[PDB]
Amino acid sequence: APHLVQVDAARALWPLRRFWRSTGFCPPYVLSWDQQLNLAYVGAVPHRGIKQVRTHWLLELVTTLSYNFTHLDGYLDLLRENQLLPGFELMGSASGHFTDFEDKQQVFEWKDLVSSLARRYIGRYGLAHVSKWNFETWNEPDHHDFDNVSMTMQGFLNYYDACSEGLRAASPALRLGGPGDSFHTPPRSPLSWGLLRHCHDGTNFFTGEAGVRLDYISLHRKGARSSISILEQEKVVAQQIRQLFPKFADTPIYNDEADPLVGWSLPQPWRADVTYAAMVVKVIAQHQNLLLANTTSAFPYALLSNDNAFLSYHPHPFAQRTLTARFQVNNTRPPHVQLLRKPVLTAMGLLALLDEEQLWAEVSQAGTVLDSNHTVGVLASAHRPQGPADAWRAAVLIYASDDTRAHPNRSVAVTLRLRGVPPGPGLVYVTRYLDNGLCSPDGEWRRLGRPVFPTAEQFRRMRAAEDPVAAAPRPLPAGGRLTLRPALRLPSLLLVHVCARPEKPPGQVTRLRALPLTQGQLVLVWSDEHVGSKCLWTYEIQFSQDYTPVSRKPSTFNLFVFSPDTGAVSGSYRVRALDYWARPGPFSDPVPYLE
Ligand SMILES: *[C@@H]1O[C@H](CO)[C@@H](O[C@@H]2O[C@H](CO)[C@@H](O[C@@H]3O[C@H](CO[C@H]4O[C@H](CO)[C@@H](O)[C@H](O)[C@@H]4O)[C@@H](O)[C@H](O[C@H]4O[C@H](CO)[C@@H](O)[C@H](O)[C@@H]4O)[C@@H]3O)[C@H](O)[C@H]2NC(C)=O)[C@H](O)[C@H]1NC(C)=O
Ligand SMILES: *[C@@H]1O[C@H](CO)[C@@H](O[C@@H]2O[C@H](CO)[C@@H](O)[C@H](O)[C@H]2NC(C)=O)[C@H](O)[C@H]1NC(C)=O
Ligand SMILES: *[C@@H]1O[C@H](CO)[C@@H](O)[C@H](O)[C@H]1NC(C)=O
Ligand SMILES: O=C(O)[C@@H]1NC[C@H](O)[C@@H](O)[C@@H]1O
């Protein structure tokens, strides 16, 4: 008996906030070419689909009274160039200087350091930019994640105050949260619980004032292979904080390491394919629907981050918890690195197509209503037209997922009933679909027999499996209703996209860059910020040697790899957007390429 998915496009319920646009990693480096390509891939997720890169040990990128901010400057500039912000964990020993936070002199030093860098980058990027950054405490303080730094309970509070007072000294508009830990039942997690007690009731190291600013409470809760388990753990902790610290009742809670499984490096075959990709969306669905959709209890939940920006290492290029697949091709002159877009990362661009309002949606199987705590679920959105640039949109993301278990031998019949689409000019819909059969670069890698140093052609073939299967813009039936009967696989993802034709064509592509990969092979990357619409089919890429179009299959991801048959890559590249109604936008400024 089929699953029935119902969407009412006229019933725009409440604000839908894109609360999941974050990633992270821990260095074992961050300036290496590998890492440069990685963040080019992250920033390429369309429509600002990933905003924050929560980076450990950022204050080991600074040497030592004055400091060398050269390495930190480089990483942050790198982030900036890919339209990303750091999850700025005030974490590190400033290359070995700081050792004890019960040393009164060291607490003062740390304050002045924090003020120093904060002011530095306000001058570098502007207060309007830096104010968006989530400054954070040392990651997992209860896990003894300290190196040679001594950090007792008392020391952690001194540390915190200095972080707080130092940031304030730069500017009061700068946000600060913590502790970034798990919050297990007392006497467990003393430093995490101790922090809240201090912020709530203790006195400020510097000002002697009762109460210390705490802008958000971040925690780490992981699902141990269960998607709903994450949400369950969050409720328990969040309620314990509502009742124990009544001042923090409205304080936003982040979960900046909300992963299905602890241990990023541990190889898992589900991490390789759409199994991960579907489960990540299930978590986001579970969160939106079963927590943030006016379910009278509404805890202030603002951020979910998947700590999955790590780079893979051999012999596990796909199986690790990473957005991209790394290949260290060691047998060319010289050795060069190549990255592949895993299903999860492709899906972060599917999620990205959702808009500011949630629509009413219901999933049932033969009468019985099923919430997102089931193998199938849906997130539906609608958009209120801003300028002449955009028009009305509906984003319907349906998922099929049994968590960390895949089922290749089963097919899931679904009937989508869409109703109540506000009438308007040239309404069309576009399906986008991902499964392990049709969209697994890991799948292709294995068809090609697991080459360790893939060739150009092997790399072309593996790449062809990144983008989801799409169908040409078909006009919507009259009445503002659509009925489809897709046969979904387990796992899969299906995004039906309904768009009305806006007044003016799309905006101009900007910030175009060419990035060398190897002989006769490069990365083209850009930005959609000035495009101002989500109703896009593909990006036209033209090449000049003296312009003719690079004939490629459709893709809206803001990153393309040019690996042509001729080996000819030197010349000039321009890029423009193409919408669902065949309309061209303005070409970006041409970018030259010398090899
Ligand atoms: C092409 O050439 C590149 C270098 O140019 C090679 O890349 C190296 O690949 C190996 C992968 O085997 C890497 O070594 C591995 O590092 C892992 C973690 O690195 C850091 O993190 C841990 C803890 O977080 C630290 O302890 C460590 O000091 C590092 O800072 C380790 O987990 C791996 O050890 C595990 O596997 C080995 C088997 O390989 C077991 O013996 C161990 O017991 C353990 O389970 C491993 O040491 C290495 O970092 C890479 N170097 C670089 C510069 O990238 C490629 O190997 C090469 N390609 C081919 C095909 O050979
Ligand atoms: C999500 O669904 C599962 C059912 O699969 C719920 O788990 C059950 O919870 C009840 C509590 O009333 C237990 O007695 C059962 O033993 C659980 N069932 C199984 C199969 O383990 C879970 O609580 C649901 N969670 C949410 C947040 O709705
Ligand atoms: C800081 O360190 C970098 C990299 O090690 C070095 O090149 C640079 O000269 C240093 N800058 C200053 C001002 O000392
Ligand atoms: O779960 C992990 O693998 C790691 N745990 C410890 C670190 O906090 C985090 O960066 C990683 O996600």
UniProtKB/Swiss-Prot annotation:
Effect listed in the UniProt record for changing A44V: In MPS1H/S; reduction of activity and protein levels
Disulfide bonds: C499-C535
Binding site for alpha-L-iduronate: H56, N139, E140, K222, E257, G263, D307, R321
Cellular component aspect of the GO annotation: extracellular exosome; lysosomal lumen
Effect in UniProt of substituting E234K: In MPS1H/S and MPS1S
Free-text description of this protein's post-translational modifications in UniProt: N-glycosylation at Asn-330 contributes to substrate binding and is required for full enzymatic activity.
Positions annotated to bind beta-D-mannose: R450
Phenotype upon changing R321C: In MPS1H/S; loss of activity
InterPro entries: GH39_as, GH39_C, GH39_cat, Glyco_hydro_39, Glycoside_hydrolase_SF, Glycosyl_Hydrolase_39, Ig-like_fold
Localization, UniProt: Lysosome
Binding positions (alpha-D-mannopyranose): P27, W264, R446, R450
Pfam families for the chain: Glyco_hydro_39, Glyco_hydro_39_C
Record's disease association: Mucopolysaccharidosis 1H: A severe form of mucopolysaccharidosis type 1, a rare lysosomal storage disease characterized by progressive physical deterioration with urinary excretion of dermatan sulfate and heparan sulfate. Patients with MPS1H usually present, within the first year of life, a combination of hepatosplenomegaly, skeletal deformities, corneal clouding and severe intellectual disability. Obstructive airways disease, respiratory infection and cardiac complications usually result in death before 10 years of age. Mucopolysaccharidosis 1H/S: A form of mucopolysaccharidosis type 1, a rare lysosomal storage disease characterized by progressive physical deterioration with urinary excretion of dermatan sulfate and heparan sulfate. MPS1H/S represents an intermediate phenotype of the MPS1 clinical spectrum. It is characterized by relatively little neurological involvement, but most of the somatic symptoms described for severe MPS1 develop in the early to mid-teens, causing considerable loss of mobility.
PANTHER family: ALPHA-L-IDURONIDASE (PTHR12631:SF8)
Protein's name in the database: Alpha-L-iduronidase
Native source organism of the sequence: Homo sapiens (Human)
